[model samples]
Target: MDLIAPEDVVVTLSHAGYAKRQPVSAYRAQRRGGRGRSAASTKEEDFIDQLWLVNTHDTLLTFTSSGKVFWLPVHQLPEAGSNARGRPIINWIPLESGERVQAVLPVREYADNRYVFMATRNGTVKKTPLSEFAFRLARGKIAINLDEGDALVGVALTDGDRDVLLFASNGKTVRFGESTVRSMGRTATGVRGIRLAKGEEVVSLIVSERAAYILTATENGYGKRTPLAEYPRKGRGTQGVIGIQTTERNGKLVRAVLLGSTDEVMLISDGGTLVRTRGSEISRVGRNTQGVTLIRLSKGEKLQAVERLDASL
Candidate 1:
C-alpha cells in the first residue's frame, strides 16, 4: 500500500516526538468571523520558536515545525465545521542536526508568489514560493562566528528591504544588508535584539546576562547607550530576550515583549509604566493589525484571545 501523506496525519504529541506534554489554550478576540482552534499539546519543538500568519488569497497559513504547514480558511463555518479546521499544505524537514527555524516573515503583498521567509539556526534563509513548496533562497553562516559556547539570541527583518539583523549569545550583532548575500557590520558587545522605531530609528536592546541595555540610534549614524531601566529583578529559569516589537499603547509608543531572563514578558509604555508576565503565564505574543497580541500560552492545546491596548504615554 502507498504510504499516507504527512498532511493526512493528524498531529499529536505522540507522533511529533514531544518529550513532555503540556496544555495549550487558544483564545481569540470577540470578532464576528471565526473562533480560535487548538493545536496538539506536547513538548514544544524548536521549530515553534516563532510563528507568522500569512494572508493568502483567502486563507491563513499556519507554519509549524511538525514539518507541517497548515492552510486555515478565513470564513465562517457550519455547525460541523465550527472549529474552522484545515489541512497542512507542506511538510518541511530540515537537513542538518541542531538546525531549526528561528523566524517566519510574511511577504507584504499577495501578488508576490513568495509568501513567507524562514531563517534557521544554521544561518540559511528559505523562501516559500507561491503555489509551490518552500525552497532555499540563501545559505551561509551568520556574519559573526562565535565559539561553540555561543548561540543565536535574536533575529529581525527590516521594514524596507528585508535586511536581516541577527544577535548571537556571544554579544555580536550582524547586519545582512538588502543587496548583500553575506552579513556585515560585525559589532561586538551586549546587543541582544534590534528594533526599528519611529522616524527610521533603530533601537538595540542588550542583554548582559543580568542587566538589559537600551541603545538608541543617533541621527549621525552611531548608537548611544542609555541607563538601564529601573525594573524589578527577574528570577531564575527565565530565558534571555528572544523577541522585541514597538507599538502604540494608550496613545503613546511603547516597547513590548522584551523576552528576557525569568521568562518575564514586559510591556513598557512611553510614560514608563511596565507590565510584566511570565512565559508560563503567556498564551501568545505576536503582531496583529491593531498592535501586538499577548495571549496566555499556559492552557493545554487552547489558543488564548488577545486585545490590543492603546499606546498611552
Candidate 2:
C-alpha cells in the first residue's frame, strides 16, 4: 500500500536506472515548442526514459526485465533539483546484479477489475489482476513467466477492453483489443501479440481508450504523428500495418507514444544528448509513411529513448 500524501510531485527515471523526485512547480513560465532543460547528467550513455507527474503519496511499481516487481512511494525518492543528476535506482530498490528496470508505473492505488497489461520483445502480451500486486512486497513478486531469451518491454494499466498498440524495431505497429489476450496469472507465458520477423522485436506498447495521435521516432532523428484512426484494429498474431516507412537514412523505429496536442516529449540520443519538442510541433504524416526530421544529430548519436510529459504543470 502507498503511504504518501496527495500532494503533487514530479518523478523521473533515467534510461540508465536513476530515480529522483521534485515538486511540480519547478518549471518556468508556460512556453511551447522545442526547448529542453537538463533532467539528468549522463556519465556515459545515460538518459531519461520515464517521467511522470503524480501525487507524492502515490505508489510506483517498478518492474524489471527479470520479472520481479519492486514497490516505491513517490515521496520517498531522494529529492533532486531540475538540472541535478538523480541517484542510481538500484540502491533505492532491491535489484540483483544485471537486472534491468523495464518499466516504472506511477499509480495512486490498486483496484479490482483493473489489470496491469504487459508486452514483451518477443511479441508476448498478458493481462494480470492489478490487485495481485497491491502488497508492497519487500523483496518482489514474479510479474510474469518470461520465456528463455525473451524479456519484458513495456507495461500499462488498462480497463480490460482498450486497444494496445505494439511498435516494433522494424517500423511496424499492430493494434489489437486488450480482450484478445485473456487474463492470465503472473506465472503464465503470454500469448502472441504480434508476428515476429527474423530481426524484429517489439519496443513500445501504448494503451488508448479514446481517439488520439501516435508518435513514431526513428533512431536517426526522424519521426511523425499519425492519427490513431489511421491504424485499424487487427487480430492478434497477424502482420501489422505499416506505422512508419523505414528507410536507410531514417533508420528503424525506436519509440512510439500517444500524446495530446498540449503534451510534450523528451528525446534522448545514444551519445547522452536530450531534446524536447511539443507534440504539436512534430509533423503529422499519413500511416505507412516516413516522417520528417525531428532533430539534428551528430555522428554516432542515434535517437534512443523518449519520455512523454503531461500538459499540466
lDDT winner: 2
Give each model's whole-structure lDDT.
0.27, 0.80
> Cα deviation in Å at residue 156, candidate 2?
0.5
Please, what are the lDDT tens digits per residue for candidate 1 over residues 1-313? Answer: 9985321111111112221111111212211423123222233322111222222223333333222233333221111121332221222223245544322233333343222333323333333333332222222223233334333323333322443433222212333332333223222222222232223222222222222323222111112122234222322112213223222221111222233322323332222223333433334322211222332232122221111121111
lDDT of model 2, residue 44: 52
List per-candidate RMSD values in Å: 16.3, 4.4
The ten-residue window of minimal lDDT in model 1 covers 304-313
Name the runs in model 1 displaced over 4 angstroms: 1-57, 76-109, 113-115, 128-160, 181-313
Candidates' TM-scores?
Answer: 0.29, 0.85
Candidate 2 lDDT tens digits, 157-230? 99887899898888777888887778888888878898977789998998997327889989999889999898
Error of 1 at 53 (Å): 10
Tell me the TM-score of model 1.
0.29
